[PDB]
Amino acid sequence: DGVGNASGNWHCDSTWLGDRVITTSTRTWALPTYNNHLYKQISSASTGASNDNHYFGYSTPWGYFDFNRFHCHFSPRDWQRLINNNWGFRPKRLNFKLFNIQVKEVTTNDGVTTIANNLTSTVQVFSDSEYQLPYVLGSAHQGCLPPFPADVFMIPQYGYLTLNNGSQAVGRSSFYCLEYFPSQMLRTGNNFTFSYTFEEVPFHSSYA
Amino acid sequence: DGVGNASGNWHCDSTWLGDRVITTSTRTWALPTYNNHLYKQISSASTGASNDNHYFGYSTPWGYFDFNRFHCHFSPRDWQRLINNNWGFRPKRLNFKLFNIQVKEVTTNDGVTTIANNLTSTVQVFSDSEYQLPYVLGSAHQGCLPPFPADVFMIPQYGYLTLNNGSQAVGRSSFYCLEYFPSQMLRTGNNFTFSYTFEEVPFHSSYAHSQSLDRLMNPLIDQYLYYLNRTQNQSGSAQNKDLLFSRGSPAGMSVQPKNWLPGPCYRQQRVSKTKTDNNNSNFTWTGASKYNLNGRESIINPGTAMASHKDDEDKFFPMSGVMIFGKESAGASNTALDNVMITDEEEIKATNPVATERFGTVAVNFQSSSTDPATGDVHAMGALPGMVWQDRDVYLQGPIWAKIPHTDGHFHPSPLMGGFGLKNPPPQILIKNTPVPANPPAEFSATKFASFITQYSTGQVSVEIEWELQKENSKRWNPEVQYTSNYAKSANVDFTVDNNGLYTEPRPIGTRYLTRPL
Amino acid sequence: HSQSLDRLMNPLIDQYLYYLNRTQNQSGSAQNKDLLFSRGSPAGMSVQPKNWLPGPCYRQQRVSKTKTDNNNSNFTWTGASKYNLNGRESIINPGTAMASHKD
Amino acid sequence: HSQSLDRLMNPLIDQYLYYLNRTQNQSGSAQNKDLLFSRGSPAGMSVQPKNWLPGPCYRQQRVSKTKTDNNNSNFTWTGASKYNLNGRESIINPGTAMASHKDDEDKFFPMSGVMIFGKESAGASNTALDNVMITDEEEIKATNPVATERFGTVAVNFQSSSTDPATGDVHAMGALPGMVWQDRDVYLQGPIWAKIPHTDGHFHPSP
Amino acid sequence: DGVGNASGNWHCDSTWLGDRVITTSTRTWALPTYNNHLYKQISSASTGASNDNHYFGYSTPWGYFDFNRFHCHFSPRDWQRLINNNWGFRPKRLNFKLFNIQVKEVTTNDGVTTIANNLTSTVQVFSDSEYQLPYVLGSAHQGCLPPFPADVFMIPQYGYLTLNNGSQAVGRSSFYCLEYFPSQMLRTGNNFTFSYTFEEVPFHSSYA
């Protein structure tokens, strides 16, 4: 509980139990300000695209965490110790944690830009556990956790697409204001945790 | 519990209890950012080295704490109060603590670089208590705690070596990411503590022997065992070959039947401390005792614990058979003799051979009426049964422990630098600054980060080892040899600071001062 | 082992122990015999003070698997390492556990 | 021991391990260098793969009990195995527990490798052979080397198409792993115990 | 318990009880950095002195508190109310306290030297209650508490003398590293207190 007190430790171990493996993975992140806090609507009119590449959507000032690659959780050794003596695997439950938050204010003055430290600024975090936003994950995008644990990554920008009569909207094109979701404002001494349990999915056939 | 609250006190006392001494030692440390947070791989390709000096490894952004010298825990007074009235010592348990952490961010602006104070930045500390990283400690490196408690030191950089086909890797060369270890992120109000218990190691022999190994007999009484004395008569008429046996022998002690043997040997070379009493060559690689491991050579250095020189022949030292420490104003390459501290290892002359001379001679052939009996010269000698020795002396400057390598076999696991061989040594405590990046751009880019905030941390660190003493039980009459300071009109007191605050150690202090019979 | 015995050091940090480096000066005027000690040595690892020793030895003889890279003799009894027990000999075979060949 | 150390095998059954047998063909046409391996070997027991080693060694010198079968010298200090402790020498005497002599070669004793007791009417200096009792230590010949002869030979150099394979002669041998031995025999006249010296290290503390 | 919380009050009263007087006295102090953190050894070689004024010693980066003058505890009125109607006095017990610690970092830049405030820097304080350092007090030196309570004083530098064969040391000249004493590192929210009881000393004859 900050200021001079850390709100979480670096857990990045991987305990192989008997008929299960628990993989933990901590990363350092960085989140800029996107769109200068605006809900800019994006489309394909300004681009001059083909008929196939037209889109209509909305870009948000919100970031999103994605850990949807296998090297975000498995080292190359733990992958080898997985693929070579197992006929299958599936995830049972995850456990997310967001901690040691540092909000930094930057101020430009003749290219001698100093970075100071806002102790009172907050960060809004919510997990959409009711699946009522467009699920942009599961689309093989960049901006995951890095493969190597000693890398600092940059959080992507959340932006969704909806229905499009070409490069124009249809009356059923949805619009989502994400400040109409209950967030958790996290000042520098606070942390975000939630837990998730995967439903019954079949084992991946890790065999020929 | 910070910010405005200290998370530990300065403990640097040394309580001498009855059959034990507890030494505490706090130091102020400083930790930079190494490799700019990168895992740079290091090898010998860019260096242009010889075949012997090739390596392949990995340097890390992690630091490590090392307190593997005896002056990190003992003052010169507590060392004197240890070596002079104890026949042994060994460590029982240590107790590590890391406290009062201050992470400072530095910012350059036209050489008017200001240092500010990150209250929210963290520091990752873990102790590898399962010994699954390469144990770079136990290698006599710099960057320990300083000898003098009022010095601020800089934490070294952790970097390991692995298998190398020359300057290239082999498929079995391991790679260790140290962020794949559970750390403890320490913001400025937090502290790191752990405790360690040493396993059963034998006491260090902090004594000399008061009696030689070849002089363990009664000088007044002869024996019942005989030896062959003459193979030729003194009748002087001719070659009168006759086997003459003799009861033996108070008047000749070199020819009595003995019962034990002096220790192993591996000869070094005479280097006198007078330059004129040396061969005009170099002679420090071509004529040095060296071992061959995977086609490349390495000087033994020091090797087998042996006596440095013969009696009243104090000027010769074995070429690589002694620990050589350094005084200040010594360079890192080709320093003069006046800047080093060459240790002598002549208190173990009673059991151990001279390092610079053979362990005796053996027979070569079969003597007959024609073939005169030729002998050879044993230079290296392994372990025979019935063989006793003493290990290498520890010093106030020198190392405390080392890790016994995890091998299927090992003979007498005492390190050749002296100290305590430990299968499970004190674990490596590794520490780094958490990377706090600078401003990311407005749009997304997955080429991760080259722009960090240039920062460093400082703090205090206190190590507390408890040592089990072994009291003398001596029934010696006359006074024994002590470590005294020369009471004379001196310009500078030994083991104190100078006119401008440089702490110097004028000579190496061993621990073999008391005596006991063999 | 993932690590050699003569390579158990930190390749980044030097030591506090010194070794004799030169027994002759580089002044090149004459036979300038002088004992030059050196702090040692991240850049030379063969000359650092070590702490352990490699195991025992009892040498065998080079037999290549290519017949042309061998001596034209036999050489399998006359030039083999053997022990003498009660006046009669016997090849060690295998003997001391040692590496078969160099890198 | 009722069985030698180099004879611990089944004399009826061969092995699955092979050894290099010939480095040259019997075709006799030329220098036909060829590596011939052979399954081995009930008919040759000196070349089988063994599993242990005979004990340590430190050679003594042949002194026969017949005066004529000796060198005409003295030869009892100049040609004796001795150790060097603090610049001064001392004969080992007896030293490493080793066999006194080879089979059916009972007249040679090692110069200082045997316990030599005394009968009565023996003097204290330069007594004759008829007044002493030289012990024999040949019952440990099964595990221990002969005191008066090498513990085998080792290689010296690298054999090639030019350098013929030279061997050396091991005279003193320390402790290798995989090495067994028997200690020196006790006698009715000889000592019972001794004190192990109070040292930091000592190898196999038998006197 | 700091930062924004004072760790002691200003007590400077003087209660005259019946057969005793309790004098309290608070002062503001200032402690520089001496010797640039070094144990500089001092002697009389560089001075060029007489035989009588030779010395050999050691100066330390440590300060010391001294309150060994009578006006550090008595006002001129309380002294008059002591000397005029008492045939004697002696001290029974003292009670020391060190509080409201402020560590200030100064930074020079073209003579526009700013003084900032280290919230995390510590101050090491110990009382040598076993008398195993050279007792430089009881020598009538400067650097006590000031007589007047509204003065800020500067803590002296600790430095001792030992045995001297002229301007050189003798083998029995002691050397004392003061970081070989258990200190109490005091960050800005911490305080130092200890208590002392005087042994039986005779009353001072405050009479003619």
mmCIF file with all atom_site columns, N, CA and C in Angstrom, chain A residues 1-53:
data_model
loop_
_atom_site.group_PDB
_atom_site.id
_atom_site.type_symbol
_atom_site.label_atom_id
_atom_site.label_alt_id
_atom_site.label_comp_id
_atom_site.label_asym_id
_atom_site.label_entity_id
_atom_site.label_seq_id
_atom_site.pdbx_PDB_ins_code
_atom_site.Cartn_x
_atom_site.Cartn_y
_atom_site.Cartn_z
_atom_site.occupancy
_atom_site.B_iso_or_equiv
_atom_site.pdbx_formal_charge
_atom_site.auth_seq_id
_atom_site.auth_comp_id
_atom_site.auth_asym_id
_atom_site.auth_atom_id
_atom_site.pdbx_PDB_model_num
ATOM 1   N N  . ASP A 1 1  ? 0.839   -1.192  0.000   1.00 0.00 ? 1  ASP A N  1
ATOM 2   C CA . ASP A 1 1  ? 0.000   0.000   0.000   1.00 0.00 ? 1  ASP A CA 1
ATOM 3   C C  . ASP A 1 1  ? 0.878   1.247   0.000   1.00 0.00 ? 1  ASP A C  1
ATOM 4   N N  . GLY A 1 2  ? 1.064   1.824   -1.190  1.00 0.00 ? 2  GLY A N  1
ATOM 5   C CA . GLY A 1 2  ? 1.932   2.967   -1.431  1.00 0.00 ? 2  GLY A CA 1
ATOM 6   C C  . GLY A 1 2  ? 1.658   4.223   -0.624  1.00 0.00 ? 2  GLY A C  1
ATOM 7   N N  . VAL A 1 3  ? 2.521   5.240   -0.689  1.00 0.00 ? 3  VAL A N  1
ATOM 8   C CA . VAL A 1 3  ? 3.533   5.479   -1.722  1.00 0.00 ? 3  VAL A CA 1
ATOM 9   C C  . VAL A 1 3  ? 4.829   4.679   -1.597  1.00 0.00 ? 3  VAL A C  1
ATOM 10  N N  . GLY A 1 4  ? 5.456   4.719   -0.430  1.00 0.00 ? 4  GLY A N  1
ATOM 11  C CA . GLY A 1 4  ? 6.713   4.025   -0.239  1.00 0.00 ? 4  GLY A CA 1
ATOM 12  C C  . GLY A 1 4  ? 6.544   2.595   0.212   1.00 0.00 ? 4  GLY A C  1
ATOM 13  N N  . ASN A 1 5  ? 5.740   1.834   -0.519  1.00 0.00 ? 5  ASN A N  1
ATOM 14  C CA . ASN A 1 5  ? 5.401   0.470   -0.148  1.00 0.00 ? 5  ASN A CA 1
ATOM 15  C C  . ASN A 1 5  ? 4.889   -0.269  -1.376  1.00 0.00 ? 5  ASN A C  1
ATOM 16  N N  . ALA A 1 6  ? 5.563   -1.350  -1.757  1.00 0.00 ? 6  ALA A N  1
ATOM 17  C CA . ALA A 1 6  ? 5.227   -2.050  -2.988  1.00 0.00 ? 6  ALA A CA 1
ATOM 18  C C  . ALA A 1 6  ? 3.974   -2.888  -2.812  1.00 0.00 ? 6  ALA A C  1
ATOM 19  N N  . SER A 1 7  ? 3.137   -2.912  -3.846  1.00 0.00 ? 7  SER A N  1
ATOM 20  C CA . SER A 1 7  ? 1.830   -3.559  -3.786  1.00 0.00 ? 7  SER A CA 1
ATOM 21  C C  . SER A 1 7  ? 1.804   -4.885  -4.528  1.00 0.00 ? 7  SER A C  1
ATOM 22  N N  . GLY A 1 8  ? 2.920   -5.580  -4.587  1.00 0.00 ? 8  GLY A N  1
ATOM 23  C CA . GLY A 1 8  ? 3.012   -6.871  -5.238  1.00 0.00 ? 8  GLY A CA 1
ATOM 24  C C  . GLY A 1 8  ? 4.462   -7.193  -5.526  1.00 0.00 ? 8  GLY A C  1
ATOM 25  N N  . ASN A 1 9  ? 4.754   -8.490  -5.610  1.00 0.00 ? 9  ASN A N  1
ATOM 26  C CA . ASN A 1 9  ? 6.092   -8.984  -5.874  1.00 0.00 ? 9  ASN A CA 1
ATOM 27  C C  . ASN A 1 9  ? 6.180   -9.534  -7.294  1.00 0.00 ? 9  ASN A C  1
ATOM 28  N N  . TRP A 1 10 ? 7.396   -9.862  -7.713  1.00 0.00 ? 10 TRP A N  1
ATOM 29  C CA . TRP A 1 10 ? 7.662   -10.392 -9.049  1.00 0.00 ? 10 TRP A CA 1
ATOM 30  C C  . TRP A 1 10 ? 7.553   -11.908 -8.993  1.00 0.00 ? 10 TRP A C  1
ATOM 31  N N  . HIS A 1 11 ? 6.427   -12.438 -9.451  1.00 0.00 ? 11 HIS A N  1
ATOM 32  C CA . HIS A 1 11 ? 6.251   -13.877 -9.528  1.00 0.00 ? 11 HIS A CA 1
ATOM 33  C C  . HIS A 1 11 ? 6.348   -14.326 -10.972 1.00 0.00 ? 11 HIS A C  1
ATOM 34  N N  . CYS A 1 12 ? 7.359   -15.139 -11.267 1.00 0.00 ? 12 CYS A N  1
ATOM 35  C CA . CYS A 1 12 ? 7.511   -15.599 -12.649 1.00 0.00 ? 12 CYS A CA 1
ATOM 36  C C  . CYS A 1 12 ? 7.969   -17.054 -12.694 1.00 0.00 ? 12 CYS A C  1
ATOM 37  N N  . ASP A 1 13 ? 7.584   -17.873 -11.721 1.00 0.00 ? 13 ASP A N  1
ATOM 38  C CA . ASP A 1 13 ? 8.073   -19.237 -11.595 1.00 0.00 ? 13 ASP A CA 1
ATOM 39  C C  . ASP A 1 13 ? 7.210   -20.157 -12.450 1.00 0.00 ? 13 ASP A C  1
ATOM 40  N N  . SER A 1 14 ? 7.540   -21.445 -12.503 1.00 0.00 ? 14 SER A N  1
ATOM 41  C CA . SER A 1 14 ? 6.715   -22.421 -13.199 1.00 0.00 ? 14 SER A CA 1
ATOM 42  C C  . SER A 1 14 ? 6.789   -23.769 -12.502 1.00 0.00 ? 14 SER A C  1
ATOM 43  N N  . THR A 1 15 ? 5.845   -24.052 -11.612 1.00 0.00 ? 15 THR A N  1
ATOM 44  C CA . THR A 1 15 ? 5.867   -25.292 -10.850 1.00 0.00 ? 15 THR A CA 1
ATOM 45  C C  . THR A 1 15 ? 5.140   -26.371 -11.634 1.00 0.00 ? 15 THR A C  1
ATOM 46  N N  . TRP A 1 16 ? 5.856   -27.444 -11.942 1.00 0.00 ? 16 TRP A N  1
ATOM 47  C CA . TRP A 1 16 ? 5.299   -28.621 -12.594 1.00 0.00 ? 16 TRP A CA 1
ATOM 48  C C  . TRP A 1 16 ? 4.856   -29.592 -11.519 1.00 0.00 ? 16 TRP A C  1
ATOM 49  N N  . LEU A 1 17 ? 3.558   -29.647 -11.268 1.00 0.00 ? 17 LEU A N  1
ATOM 50  C CA . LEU A 1 17 ? 3.031   -30.639 -10.344 1.00 0.00 ? 17 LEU A CA 1
ATOM 51  C C  . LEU A 1 17 ? 2.791   -31.934 -11.113 1.00 0.00 ? 17 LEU A C  1
ATOM 52  N N  . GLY A 1 18 ? 2.044   -32.852 -10.511 1.00 0.00 ? 18 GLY A N  1
ATOM 53  C CA . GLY A 1 18 ? 1.885   -34.180 -11.070 1.00 0.00 ? 18 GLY A CA 1
ATOM 54  C C  . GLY A 1 18 ? 1.145   -34.249 -12.388 1.00 0.00 ? 18 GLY A C  1
ATOM 55  N N  . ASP A 1 19 ? -0.143  -33.947 -12.364 1.00 0.00 ? 19 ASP A N  1
ATOM 56  C CA . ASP A 1 19 ? -0.975  -33.995 -13.561 1.00 0.00 ? 19 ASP A CA 1
ATOM 57  C C  . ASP A 1 19 ? -1.431  -32.596 -13.949 1.00 0.00 ? 19 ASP A C  1
ATOM 58  N N  . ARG A 1 20 ? -0.554  -31.633 -13.664 1.00 0.00 ? 20 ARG A N  1
ATOM 59  C CA . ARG A 1 20 ? -0.792  -30.228 -13.955 1.00 0.00 ? 20 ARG A CA 1
ATOM 60  C C  . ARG A 1 20 ? 0.482   -29.396 -13.909 1.00 0.00 ? 20 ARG A C  1
ATOM 61  N N  . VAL A 1 21 ? 0.484   -28.270 -14.616 1.00 0.00 ? 21 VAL A N  1
ATOM 62  C CA . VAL A 1 21 ? 1.579   -27.310 -14.591 1.00 0.00 ? 21 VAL A CA 1
ATOM 63  C C  . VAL A 1 21 ? 0.989   -25.925 -14.343 1.00 0.00 ? 21 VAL A C  1
ATOM 64  N N  . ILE A 1 22 ? 1.545   -25.207 -13.371 1.00 0.00 ? 22 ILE A N  1
ATOM 65  C CA . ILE A 1 22 ? 1.115   -23.850 -13.066 1.00 0.00 ? 22 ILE A CA 1
ATOM 66  C C  . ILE A 1 22 ? 2.224   -22.925 -13.542 1.00 0.00 ? 22 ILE A C  1
ATOM 67  N N  . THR A 1 23 ? 1.915   -22.101 -14.529 1.00 0.00 ? 23 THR A N  1
ATOM 68  C CA . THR A 1 23 ? 2.870   -21.157 -15.076 1.00 0.00 ? 23 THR A CA 1
ATOM 69  C C  . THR A 1 23 ? 2.499   -19.747 -14.654 1.00 0.00 ? 23 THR A C  1
ATOM 70  N N  . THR A 1 24 ? 3.455   -19.048 -14.057 1.00 0.00 ? 24 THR A N  1
ATOM 71  C CA . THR A 1 24 ? 3.305   -17.663 -13.638 1.00 0.00 ? 24 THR A CA 1
ATOM 72  C C  . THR A 1 24 ? 4.241   -16.813 -14.491 1.00 0.00 ? 24 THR A C  1
ATOM 73  N N  . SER A 1 25 ? 3.855   -15.562 -14.732 1.00 0.00 ? 25 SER A N  1
ATOM 74  C CA . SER A 1 25 ? 4.618   -14.712 -15.633 1.00 0.00 ? 25 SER A CA 1
ATOM 75  C C  . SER A 1 25 ? 4.388   -13.229 -15.384 1.00 0.00 ? 25 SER A C  1
ATOM 76  N N  . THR A 1 26 ? 5.369   -12.541 -14.814 1.00 0.00 ? 26 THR A N  1
ATOM 77  C CA . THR A 1 26 ? 5.259   -11.115 -14.558 1.00 0.00 ? 26 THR A CA 1
ATOM 78  C C  . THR A 1 26 ? 5.968   -10.334 -15.659 1.00 0.00 ? 26 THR A C  1
ATOM 79  N N  . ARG A 1 27 ? 5.349   -9.233  -16.081 1.00 0.00 ? 27 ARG A N  1
ATOM 80  C CA . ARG A 1 27 ? 5.939   -8.336  -17.066 1.00 0.00 ? 27 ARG A CA 1
ATOM 81  C C  . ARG A 1 27 ? 5.780   -6.906  -16.588 1.00 0.00 ? 27 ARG A C  1
ATOM 82  N N  . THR A 1 28 ? 6.699   -6.049  -17.017 1.00 0.00 ? 28 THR A N  1
ATOM 83  C CA . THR A 1 28 ? 6.576   -4.612  -16.837 1.00 0.00 ? 28 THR A CA 1
ATOM 84  C C  . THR A 1 28 ? 5.906   -4.007  -18.065 1.00 0.00 ? 28 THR A C  1
ATOM 85  N N  . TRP A 1 29 ? 4.896   -3.173  -17.840 1.00 0.00 ? 29 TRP A N  1
ATOM 86  C CA . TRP A 1 29 ? 4.140   -2.576  -18.929 1.00 0.00 ? 29 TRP A CA 1
ATOM 87  C C  . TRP A 1 29 ? 4.271   -1.064  -18.920 1.00 0.00 ? 29 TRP A C  1
ATOM 88  N N  . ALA A 1 30 ? 3.837   -0.463  -20.023 1.00 0.00 ? 30 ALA A N  1
ATOM 89  C CA . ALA A 1 30 ? 3.794   0.980   -20.190 1.00 0.00 ? 30 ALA A CA 1
ATOM 90  C C  . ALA A 1 30 ? 2.548   1.330   -20.984 1.00 0.00 ? 30 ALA A C  1
ATOM 91  N N  . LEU A 1 31 ? 1.793   2.305   -20.505 1.00 0.00 ? 31 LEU A N  1
ATOM 92  C CA . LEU A 1 31 ? 0.527   2.688   -21.123 1.00 0.00 ? 31 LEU A CA 1
ATOM 93  C C  . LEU A 1 31 ? 0.524   4.162   -21.461 1.00 0.00 ? 31 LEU A C  1
ATOM 94  N N  . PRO A 1 32 ? 0.466   4.536   -22.725 1.00 0.00 ? 32 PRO A N  1
ATOM 95  C CA . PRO A 1 32 ? 0.410   5.951   -23.084 1.00 0.00 ? 32 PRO A CA 1
ATOM 96  C C  . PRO A 1 32 ? -1.020  6.464   -23.007 1.00 0.00 ? 32 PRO A C  1
ATOM 97  N N  . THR A 1 33 ? -1.194  7.697   -23.450 1.00 0.00 ? 33 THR A N  1
ATOM 98  C CA . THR A 1 33 ? -2.511  8.274   -23.640 1.00 0.00 ? 33 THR A CA 1
ATOM 99  C C  . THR A 1 33 ? -2.860  8.195   -25.118 1.00 0.00 ? 33 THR A C  1
ATOM 100 N N  . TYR A 1 34 ? -3.942  7.495   -25.432 1.00 0.00 ? 34 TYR A N  1
ATOM 101 C CA . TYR A 1 34 ? -4.369  7.302   -26.804 1.00 0.00 ? 34 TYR A CA 1
ATOM 102 C C  . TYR A 1 34 ? -5.486  8.271   -27.154 1.00 0.00 ? 34 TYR A C  1
ATOM 103 N N  . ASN A 1 35 ? -5.479  8.699   -28.420 1.00 0.00 ? 35 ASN A N  1
ATOM 104 C CA . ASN A 1 35 ? -6.451  9.602   -29.038 1.00 0.00 ? 35 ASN A CA 1
ATOM 105 C C  . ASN A 1 35 ? -6.598  10.963  -28.372 1.00 0.00 ? 35 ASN A C  1
ATOM 106 N N  . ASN A 1 36 ? -5.692  11.302  -27.447 1.00 0.00 ? 36 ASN A N  1
ATOM 107 C CA . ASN A 1 36 ? -5.797  12.428  -26.527 1.00 0.00 ? 36 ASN A CA 1
ATOM 108 C C  . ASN A 1 36 ? -7.156  12.391  -25.836 1.00 0.00 ? 36 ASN A C  1
ATOM 109 N N  . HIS A 1 37 ? -7.466  11.237  -25.237 1.00 0.00 ? 37 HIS A N  1
ATOM 110 C CA . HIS A 1 37 ? -8.657  10.942  -24.443 1.00 0.00 ? 37 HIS A CA 1
ATOM 111 C C  . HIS A 1 37 ? -9.953  10.968  -25.243 1.00 0.00 ? 37 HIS A C  1
ATOM 112 N N  . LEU A 1 38 ? -9.927  10.705  -26.543 1.00 0.00 ? 38 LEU A N  1
ATOM 113 C CA . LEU A 1 38 ? -11.115 10.874  -27.362 1.00 0.00 ? 38 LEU A CA 1
ATOM 114 C C  . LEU A 1 38 ? -11.603 9.551   -27.934 1.00 0.00 ? 38 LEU A C  1
ATOM 115 N N  . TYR A 1 39 ? -12.888 9.518   -28.250 1.00 0.00 ? 39 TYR A N  1
ATOM 116 C CA . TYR A 1 39 ? -13.499 8.405   -28.961 1.00 0.00 ? 39 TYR A CA 1
ATOM 117 C C  . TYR A 1 39 ? -13.564 8.701   -30.450 1.00 0.00 ? 39 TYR A C  1
ATOM 118 N N  . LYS A 1 40 ? -12.427 8.626   -31.128 1.00 0.00 ? 40 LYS A N  1
ATOM 119 C CA . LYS A 1 40 ? -12.385 8.921   -32.550 1.00 0.00 ? 40 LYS A CA 1
ATOM 120 C C  . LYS A 1 40 ? -12.974 7.772   -33.347 1.00 0.00 ? 40 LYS A C  1
ATOM 121 N N  . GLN A 1 41 ? -13.885 8.091   -34.257 1.00 0.00 ? 41 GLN A N  1
ATOM 122 C CA . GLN A 1 41 ? -14.513 7.073   -35.083 1.00 0.00 ? 41 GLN A CA 1
ATOM 123 C C  . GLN A 1 41 ? -13.671 6.879   -36.334 1.00 0.00 ? 41 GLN A C  1
ATOM 124 N N  . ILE A 1 42 ? -13.450 5.640   -36.687 1.00 0.00 ? 42 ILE A N  1
ATOM 125 C CA . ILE A 1 42 ? -12.569 5.297   -37.788 1.00 0.00 ? 42 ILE A CA 1
ATOM 126 C C  . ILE A 1 42 ? -13.381 4.603   -38.863 1.00 0.00 ? 42 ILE A C  1
ATOM 127 N N  . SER A 1 43 ? -12.991 4.829   -40.107 1.00 0.00 ? 43 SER A N  1
ATOM 128 C CA . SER A 1 43 ? -13.674 4.229   -41.238 1.00 0.00 ? 43 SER A CA 1
ATOM 129 C C  . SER A 1 43 ? -12.677 4.139   -42.380 1.00 0.00 ? 43 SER A C  1
ATOM 130 N N  . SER A 1 44 ? -13.169 3.729   -43.541 1.00 0.00 ? 44 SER A N  1
ATOM 131 C CA . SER A 1 44 ? -12.293 3.532   -44.681 1.00 0.00 ? 44 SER A CA 1
ATOM 132 C C  . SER A 1 44 ? -12.450 4.600   -45.748 1.00 0.00 ? 44 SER A C  1
ATOM 133 N N  . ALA A 1 45 ? -13.123 5.706   -45.443 1.00 0.00 ? 45 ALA A N  1
ATOM 134 C CA . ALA A 1 45 ? -13.346 6.752   -46.432 1.00 0.00 ? 45 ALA A CA 1
ATOM 135 C C  . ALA A 1 45 ? -12.059 7.503   -46.733 1.00 0.00 ? 45 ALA A C  1
ATOM 136 N N  . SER A 1 46 ? -11.302 7.830   -45.690 1.00 0.00 ? 46 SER A N  1
ATOM 137 C CA . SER A 1 46 ? -10.085 8.617   -45.842 1.00 0.00 ? 46 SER A CA 1
ATOM 138 C C  . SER A 1 46 ? -8.951  7.790   -46.430 1.00 0.00 ? 46 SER A C  1
ATOM 139 N N  . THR A 1 47 ? -9.064  6.465   -46.344 1.00 0.00 ? 47 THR A N  1
ATOM 140 C CA . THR A 1 47 ? -7.988  5.589   -46.790 1.00 0.00 ? 47 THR A CA 1
ATOM 141 C C  . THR A 1 47 ? -7.992  5.385   -48.298 1.00 0.00 ? 47 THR A C  1
ATOM 142 N N  . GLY A 1 48 ? -9.165  5.299   -48.912 1.00 0.00 ? 48 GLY A N  1
ATOM 143 C CA . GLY A 1 48 ? -9.242  4.971   -50.319 1.00 0.00 ? 48 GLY A CA 1
ATOM 144 C C  . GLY A 1 48 ? -8.889  3.519   -50.559 1.00 0.00 ? 48 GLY A C  1
ATOM 145 N N  . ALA A 1 49 ? -9.732  2.616   -50.072 1.00 0.00 ? 49 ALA A N  1
ATOM 146 C CA . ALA A 1 49 ? -9.470  1.190   -50.105 1.00 0.00 ? 49 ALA A CA 1
ATOM 147 C C  . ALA A 1 49 ? -10.293 0.521   -51.199 1.00 0.00 ? 49 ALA A C  1
ATOM 148 N N  . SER A 1 50 ? -10.181 -0.799  -51.268 1.00 0.00 ? 50 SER A N  1
ATOM 149 C CA . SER A 1 50 ? -11.004 -1.621  -52.137 1.00 0.00 ? 50 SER A CA 1
ATOM 150 C C  . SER A 1 50 ? -12.310 -1.932  -51.426 1.00 0.00 ? 50 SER A C  1
ATOM 151 N N  . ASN A 1 51 ? -13.208 -2.632  -52.117 1.00 0.00 ? 51 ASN A N  1
ATOM 152 C CA . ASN A 1 51 ? -14.502 -2.995  -51.553 1.00 0.00 ? 51 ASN A CA 1
ATOM 153 C C  . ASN A 1 51 ? -14.320 -3.990  -50.415 1.00 0.00 ? 51 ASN A C  1
ATOM 154 N N  . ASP A 1 52 ? -13.291 -4.826  -50.515 1.00 0.00 ? 52 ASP A N  1
ATOM 155 C CA . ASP A 1 52 ? -13.058 -5.865  -49.523 1.00 0.00 ? 52 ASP A CA 1
ATOM 156 C C  . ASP A 1 52 ? -12.483 -5.310  -48.231 1.00 0.00 ? 52 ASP A C  1
ATOM 157 N N  . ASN A 1 53 ? -11.737 -4.217  -48.309 1.00 0.00 ? 53 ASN A N  1
ATOM 158 C CA . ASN A 1 53 ? -11.025 -3.694  -47.157 1.00 0.00 ? 53 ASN A CA 1
ATOM 159 C C  . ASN A 1 53 ? -11.742 -2.526  -46.496 1.00 0.00 ? 53 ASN A C  1
#
